[PDB]
């Protein structure tokens, strides 16, 4: 194992300081993160991640031709969060980021002032850290991109990027101190994952014929799920196929041959809107599937948090099952079931519940509520993979007439996280007629212990309504968006904007597996709704 793979895995596993100084805005908290502190950087270390990211955009923070001389008071920061996280021990990658699309896109248009931003950053950059620790290291462009005169992708695109990385390449080697061996790292365009962008950095990296160079790409999962769309609400065979191949392509390029490969990006796309719009179970057995296989394959990652992660003003993740899902992730398998809910009907005499667990090579030793354990045979079963709640302690668990989550069952295993069953009382869930503008809309709805996975809607004679009308599923949170503290169902704006004055069916899916039907006529700025 060479020294640059050493230094990779060694990174493992990272953590991205998301729209902070790549806010595109006067400074770092213009996109509503604080500014930096001290303690942010020792608890990403605390936590146990061993590298950090460190996105910077700095176009409004350049002077002008020809020096484009950085503003001293922003890359003081900046580079006072790097000592920071080196004095945590920690990797650090540091980049230019929406630059990308800001002006170094429109290369093809206005080359020599491209180059010549592109050349000034680079040399400040360098210069600035040419002492710094070889832990440091620095990464070309984020995501890069050009303008499309018919598509991206085209053959002159694949030119401009090598044309950057071979600029910084040189650049940061002319350098020279701890520049000469410090790592590079070098993304494929757009930092995406089909064959021919990988080919083409193989190829870049080859010419550059130097043993301190890290390939970089970013994954956000398979589309139509990531974003809850197109009926794409579970994480099913399509997604789990996409992460196999997509990652066995990079393995194949890069790894294989010796050549490093920093995930510098994953998540799920949806998550820009809000980690609501998957569902929790299905996330966690997402992300748990993706770090397998990352795993697998010697892929250091890093993960994207844009400030929804990790609470920065209290310094603990918002989800902590979903970090310990990521930690545990780090060093195995965590067991799964095929869903994270346990549903019980109100109105229902209760009866023994069967749940299929994925035991991804783990055994499950016991089970838990509020961290007591439960009573084998009387309490629960197991038989192989598949476990039966007991009717007396569903039972004992529950409330009649309470809706909702009734208790948290927690099953345990003799290795990974653990797997938690909410235990969901419901009823039908029901819808109430209303009436008002496009730009007001909302159902009010009785959820009754129930949650929306997604929203199909149809003009009266079978046509797709609304965005994205190769398909009757509507995207989540875009288009509707389930409120439950507020009882009601948005339909947003964006959802009216494209659908023609006409009667349109929808059909709310819920995870229970409950489908309501819902009416609305629209014309013109007025929508009613009808039961």
Same mark, same amino acid.
């Given at each position: ?13 990272? %953590? ?14 213009? %996109? ?37 001389? &950085? ?50 950053? /680079?040399?400040? +950059? ?85 043993? !301190? ?11 139509? *799920?990531?974003? =809850? ?48 719009? &998957? ?15 990352? !795993? ?14 990790? =609470?920065?003003?209290?310094?603990? %993740?918002? #989800?902590?099952?979903?970090? =310990?899902? +990521? ?13 994270? +809910?346990?549903?019980?009907? #109100? ?65 345990? *295993?003799?290795?990974?996280? #653990? ?5 969901? !009382? ?43 009308? %190769? ?13 439950? #503290? ?10 009216? =904007? ?11 899916? *819920? /995870? ?10 629209? !014309? ?8």
């Amino acid at each position: 194992q060479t020294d640059i793979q050493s230094y990779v895995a060694d990174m493992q596993p990272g %953590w991205n300081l998301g729209n902070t100084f790549d806010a595109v805005g006067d400074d770092e908290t213009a %996109w509503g993160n604080p500014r930096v502190t001290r303690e942010l950087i020792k608890t990403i270390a605390d936590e146990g991640y061993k590298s950090i990211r460190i996105p910077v955009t700095w176009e409004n923070q350049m002077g002008n031709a020809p020096d484009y001389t &950085i503003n001293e008071d922003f890359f003081s920061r900046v580079e006072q969060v790097i000592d920071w996280a080196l004095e945590e021990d920690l990797y650090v990658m540091l980049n230019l980021h929406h630059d990308s699309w800001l002006w170094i896109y429109n290369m093809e248009h206005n080359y020599d002032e491209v180059m010549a931003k592109y050349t000034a950053l /680079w040399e400040q +950059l360098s210069e600035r850290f040419q002492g710094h620790s070889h832990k440091l290291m620095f990464e070309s462009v984020n995501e890069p991109r050009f303008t499309r005169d018919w598509g991206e992708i085209q053959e002159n695109h694949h030119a401009f990027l090598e044309e950057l990385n071979t600029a910084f390449y040189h650049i940061v080697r002319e350098s020279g101190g701890s520049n000469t061996e410090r790592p590079l790292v070098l993304p494929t365009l757009e930092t995406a994952t089909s064959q021919d962008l990988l080919n083409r950095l193989h190829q870049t990296m080859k010419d550059l014929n130097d043993p !301190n160079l890290i390939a970089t790409v970013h994954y956000y999962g398979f589309w139509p *799920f990531s974003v =809850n769309v197109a009926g794409y609400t579970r994480f099913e065979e399509e997604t789990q196929q996409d992460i196999i191949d997509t990652f066995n392509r990079v393995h194949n390029t890069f790894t294989a041959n010796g050549i490093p490969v920093v995930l510098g990006e994953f998540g799920l796309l949806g998550f820009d809107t809000s980690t609501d719009v &998957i569902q929790q179970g299905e996330k966690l057995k997402f992300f748990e599937f993706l770090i397998h296989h990352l !795993n697998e394959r010697d892929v250091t990652h890093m993960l994207w948090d844009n400030g929804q992660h990790l =609470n920065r003003e209290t310094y603990s %993740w918002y #989800d902590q099952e979903f970090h =310990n899902m +990521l930690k545990a992730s780090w060093e195995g398998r965590s067991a799964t079931a095929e869903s994270n +809910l346990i549903h019980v009907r #109100d109105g229902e005499p209760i009866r023994d519940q069967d749940i299929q667990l994925h035991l991804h090579g783990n055994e499950l030793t016991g089970l838990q509520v509020d961290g007591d354990s439960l009573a084998l045979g009387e309490d629960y079963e197991l038989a192989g993979d598949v476990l039966t709640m007991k009717a007396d302690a569903l039972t004992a668990l529950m409330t009649p007439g309470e809706l909702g989550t009734n208790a948290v069952i927690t099953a345990q *295993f003799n290795s990974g996280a #653990d797997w938690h069953f909410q235990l969901q !009382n419901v009823d039908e869930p029901t819808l109430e007629n209303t009436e008002g503008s496009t730009s007001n809309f909302a159902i009010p709805a009785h959820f009754n212990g129930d949650s929306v996975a997604t929203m199909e809607a149809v003009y009266a004679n079978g046509e797709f309504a609304g965005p994205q009308n %190769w398909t009757s599923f509507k995207e989540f949170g875009y288009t509707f968006s389930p409120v439950y #503290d507020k009882g009601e169902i948005v339909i947003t704006d964006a959802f009216f =904007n494209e659908v023609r004055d006409d009667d349109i069916h929808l059909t709310f899916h *819920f /995870w229970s597996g409950e489908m309501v039907e819902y009416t609305l006529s629209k !014309n013109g700025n007025h929508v009613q709704g009808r039961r």
